[PDB]
Design a protein around this ligand. Structure first.
Ligand SMILES: C[C@@H](C(=O)N1CCOCC1)N1CC[C@H](NS(=O)(=O)CCc2ccc(Cl)s2)C1=O
Ligand SMILES: [Ca+2]
Ligand code: NA
Lengths: 10, 28, 251
């Protein structure tokens, strides 16, 4: 469903 | 100071497809 | 949004997505009011009856979006929360009176074609635009129906409803900090916000200066797009004194 966002944001 | 002016609309003097519907409702 | 349509590109550049880190998911809408401040509904962050009490670290805001689920590389900006502020008289126990919250971002977001803040009304703007019959516009990635989810940002324009009609449509106690909007039954047009749209903005375009002002925040409704029912919005101008206090004090 939701596409992974860059790891820097998490 | 530049709030509420959309780069792709107001800023370029283009109108979106339904804003006219809003203006037409502002009768008073 | 129920019975809305796809937003055009850059049509609502103040639209913000409130995003839960894990599990990854849309929590609510929100709106960009400057480079460091985002406005949303208090109940998107704090609602004890459902064990909802988010902290800054639990959340992200995604700004400049069109697609709901896609990561929009080179378009959207993802920001971290520095501090959440909830109206101190937000009434979650009863009727969501004063359903408003501010979020300060860790860093200023850069403006672009897809990212641009909305104006907040002053006394005069509120007085002239907040009239029964006048249409505003609601955007969000919430449910397409009461009983699924959109591929892209949805938009619907809805008329402000007379206060007696709002009151007579529900058993919930309505306050001066709320207004309702939506079409009457058999009018020939429908539309409403729905679950997931909350915290999003109800905006109006001033015919005086051609600027968009956020008059409302999507707050609550009893179902979505039901006949004889209306969506309720936090009245933004009525709460502007609190908004200003938080901003002058912590910004
Ligand atoms: C009364 C309110 C409430 O107590 N909330 C809001 C959700 O978070 C918990 C507190 N509530 C409970 C469930 C209901 N959601 S809903 O039936 O999907 C119609 C959502 C909306 C329709 C029109 C507007 Cl504006 S918004 C809703 O809005
Ligand atoms: Ca009533
Ligand atoms: Na309705």
């Amino acid at each position: 469903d939701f596409e992974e966002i860059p790891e820097e944001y998490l | 100071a530049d709030c509420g002016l959309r780069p792709l609309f107001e800023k370029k003097s283009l109108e979106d497809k339904t804003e006219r519907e809003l203006l037409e409702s502002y009768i008073d | 949004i129920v019975e809305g349509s796809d937003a055009e590109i850059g049509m609502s550049p103040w639209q913000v997505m409130l995003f839960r880190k894990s599990p990854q998911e849309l929590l609510c809408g929100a709106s960009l009011i400057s480079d460091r401040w985002v406005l949303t509904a208090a109940h998107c962050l704090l609602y004890p009856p459902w064990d909802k009490n988010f902290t800054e670290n639990d959340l992200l805001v995604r700004i400049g979006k069109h697609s709901r689920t896609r990561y929009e590389r080179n378009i959207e900006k993802i920001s971290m929360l520095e501090k959440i502020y909830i109206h101190p008289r937000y009434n979650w126990r009863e009727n969501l009176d004063r359903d408003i919250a501010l979020m300060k971002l860790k860093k200023p977001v850069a403006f672009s074609d897809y990212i641009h803040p909305v104006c907040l009304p002053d006394r005069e703007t509120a007085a002239s635009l907040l009239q029964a019959g006048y249409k505003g516009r609601v955007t969000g990635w919430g449910n397409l129906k009461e009983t699924g989810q959109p591929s892209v940002l949805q938009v619907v324009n809805l008329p402000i409803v007379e206060r007696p009609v709002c009151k007579d449509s529900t058993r919930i106690r309505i306050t001066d900090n709320m207004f309702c909007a939506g079409y009457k039954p058999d009018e020939g047009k429908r539309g409403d916000a729905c679950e997931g749209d909350s915290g999003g903005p109800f905006v109006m375009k001033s015919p005086f200066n051609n600027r968009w002002y956020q008059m409302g925040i999507v707050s609550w409704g009893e179902g979505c797009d039901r006949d004889g029912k209306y969506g309720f919005y936090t009245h933004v101008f009525r709460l502007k004194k609190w908004i200003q206090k938080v901003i002058d004090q912590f910004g």
